[PDB]
Design a binder for this molecule. Structure first.
Ligand SMILES: CC(=O)N1CCC[C@@H]1C(=O)NCC#CBr
Length: 129
């Protein structure tokens, strides 16, 4: 896409050690599945296209972009070594939305609904086995 949007986060790298764990399987099969299909998922399912949204300051503000499309590819590609890496990616996606936008805002209300569901699912994350 546009040269004015940054390259998206890495989803493949042969140099990075990778593992499947039961927690990571849970994050794909339960957590990501549940959030992906939620009514309010759609603004988070791909990187922010700052050109299409006419937000030329977006990547001036947000220097650690993350989206659930990236997270889904990372899980499907077995990119992570542990669950914490993937939980941190979800936390970074929510925080970016709250930093860029204002407490009133539609997208913030949507992210807050998704975050509440994500935290309920993390409360049920199994012990690593
Ligand atoms: C980080 C963030 O803002 N996000 C995540 C999803 C897209 C959203 C955004 O920028 N546009 C939505 C509205 C308004 Br103005």
């Amino acid at each position: 896409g546009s040269h004015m949007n940054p390259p998206p986060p890495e989803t493949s790298n042969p140099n990075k050690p990778k593992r499947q764990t039961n927690q990571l399987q849970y994050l794909l099969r339960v957590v990501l599945k549940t959030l992906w299909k939620h009514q309010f998922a759609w603004p988070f399912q791909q990187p922010v296209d700052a050109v299409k949204l006419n937000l030329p300051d977006y990547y001036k503000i947000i220097k650690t972009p993350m989206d659930m499309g990236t997270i889904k590819k990372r899980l499907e590609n077995n990119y992570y070594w542990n669950a914490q890496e993937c939980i941190q990616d979800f936390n970074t996606m929510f925080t970016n939305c709250y930093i860029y936008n204002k407490p009133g805002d539609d997208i913030v209300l949507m992210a807050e609904a998704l975050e509440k569901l994500f935290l309920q699912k993390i409360n049920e994350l199994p012990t690593e086995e």
